[PDB]
Design a protein around this ligand. Structure first.
Ligand SMILES: [Cl-]
Ligand SMILES: [Cl-]
Lengths: 368, 365
């Protein structure tokens, strides 16, 4: 049976990384485990839910080569509560596992690694490099508008599109579209894939986000691979033709509004206090020369607010789900934003001067 | 109707203080409200649940005197989300309320203050002064061992006892006793009262906890009053004879253990990961120079050895790990003394300076 010695801090960092691929609630028991693979010359921790696989290398000494699967919850809680010293992990043929550190000892029962579905081999072709910061930020800037249900599988993921030195990240749920553009310093072959939402959410939790550290990405047909520090994230891709959205990014508008981003965000956020879970009231905007008036009313009461704007084009009254504006404005760093509208039934676009983003929000249909 | 102008920050600090006395659930609709009393020369915010009442003074301008009750949840959320400018509050005779700030305006409906149960007048006799730090810490050091049910009303509160310059704070739930002693620089008349657990929990949430800021306390028969900054907390007291506990603090023991507080705490905390949703005891095997701790469940087992200095008999004793965890988490000392007689008798956690006594009953496993 297996025998290893690891520093607690290295083992803790590792279990905390691979745990993001351990299913929250499942009927599959081996999926609730972390695999310890010490069969070769490296200590490898692994978690796989069949969609998302996470692998990490732990620094340590292999005294006796071996493999074991341990309950992810019990093993992480053990590692997290052990003293800050060397941790010994020892197993036997009956899968009885002893985890020892200083004068403390835990006896638990593991499972055979033969039941564990290993992360598949993925051929590494062309590599894409992004800073940890850029990847974490582009997910934060788009992840909120993926669908909250499984009615359409493609809507539960994010489109990743590369053409020459440009990357475009897209999410949509049928009510809005979030698009981010990134100019890269390298030229790459064209690629268009849909990454599951859960993959991007879980990778957000393990990527520190330094602007000085990089992520190497591989897109090989049915899989996406992310490498950073001593971790490998492998994810299945969503199959099918993604929505044709370039047709909807019609550059024609009848109204353009320049407004302070923080004032708009604070006002829409104020309005939401009047509408609670059992209510679904739109925020009404009345855009005139130099002014935007926002209203909401409910059983709790009403709100009226005026915001100074710079408006070009037609006066317009338009309604929206406040949540959609709050989600997009929360991820816009710019001091001011440009709102583009055609009419009260047409989409509204939040765009910037530098071409970094497009947030499309569908308004409320009042049916005239 | 009423008309007031207040800075948002002053109004926010005030609603955040009085909200701690707003009952989560009530039989009287009006008690879900915060009372704004601007009938005299001060702006007073007030909340009450019939047991605990909180009053606070807001700096501002009274343009038109008046009283209104506003839903505590809606009013606090409004104040918290308004811009950082002056907030105007205006009401009419139909209780329609306008809350305005900068270019934002809210229209809500209030209630008459005439339905509100005001904090009663409490005669201020002898005053007791404690730092905010001391009061916040003594509650943290004892509040965890009040009863989690209402089977016995006295067990849901904490005993507050004063004799000359000594204050003693006691909580018990039938399985353990937490006693804290505080030496004060003033001498006071004897007082023995039982303060509701909820009062102490709510006051911990509003006391900043500075060692340089003081709390003035008044104990007048049926009530306890706490005063700090621009806030007054009033609470009813629990009636009845508190448990005779001095009889149980028998100084006789057969085993004394000196152990590192952090080492014991970390070990008992490690053991708890093996008990989930299960109620298994932690078993201690105390011998010369060593304490062995064990726990066994369906998940697995743990064995741990801790270096100790032991005087007296070897002993094997079992406990609910939670009771040790709760007490050790509030002990600041590097080392603790454990005193025992036998596996069925209480265990005492004591310090050398007489600052505390934590009594824990063992589990007769
Ligand atoms: Cl791979
Ligand atoms: Cl507070």
């Amino acid at each position: 049976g297996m025998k290893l010695i690891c520093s607690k801090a290295n083992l803790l960092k590792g279990v905390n990384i691979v745990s993001k691929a351990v299913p929250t609630r499942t009927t599959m028991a081996i999926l609730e485990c972390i695999l310890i693979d010490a069969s070769a010359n490296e200590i490898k921790l692994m978690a796989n839910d069949m969609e998302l696989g996470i692998e990490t290398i732990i620094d340590g000494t292999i005294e006796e080569r071996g493999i074991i699967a341990l309950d992810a919850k019990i093993f992480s809680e053990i590692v997290r509560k052990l003293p800050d010293n060397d941790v010994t992990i020892e197993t036997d043929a009956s899968f009885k596992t002893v985890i020892s550190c200083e004068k403390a000892k835990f006896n638990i029962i593991g499972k055979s690694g033969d039941d564990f579905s290993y992360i598949p081999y993925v051929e590494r072709n062309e590599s894409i490099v992004l800073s940890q910061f850029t990847l974490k930020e582009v997910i934060r800037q788009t992840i909120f508008s993926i669908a909250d249900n499984d009615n359409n599988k493609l809507m539960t993921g994010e489109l990743f599109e590369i053409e020459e030195n440009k990357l475009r990240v897209v999410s949509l749920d049928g009510h809005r579209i979030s698009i981010r553009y990134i100019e890269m310093k390298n030229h790459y072959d064209s690629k268009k894939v849909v990454v599951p939402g859960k993959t991007l959410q879980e990778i957000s939790k393990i990527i520190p986000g330094s602007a000085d550290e990089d992520v190497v990405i591989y897109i090989t047909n049915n899989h996406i691979v992310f490498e950073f520090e001593n971790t490998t994230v492998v994810s299945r891709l969503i199959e099918g033709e993604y929505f044709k959205i370039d047709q909807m990014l019609s550059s024609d508008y009848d109204t353009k509004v320049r407004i302070n981003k923080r004032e708009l965000l604070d006002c829409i956020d104020r309005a939401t206090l009047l509408v609670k879970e059992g209510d679904k009231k739109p925020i009404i905007m009345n855009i005139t020369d130099g002014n935007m008036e926002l209203r909401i009313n409910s059983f709790i009461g009403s709100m009226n607010e005026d915001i100074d704007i710079d408006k070009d084009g037609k006066d317009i009254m338009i309604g929206f789900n406040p949540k959609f504006f709050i989600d997009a404005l929360r991820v816009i760093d710019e001091e001011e934003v440009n709102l583009y509208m055609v009419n009260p039934k047409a989409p509204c676009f939040i765009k910037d001067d530098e071409g970094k983003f497009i947030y499309l929000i569908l308004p409320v249909n009042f049916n005239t």
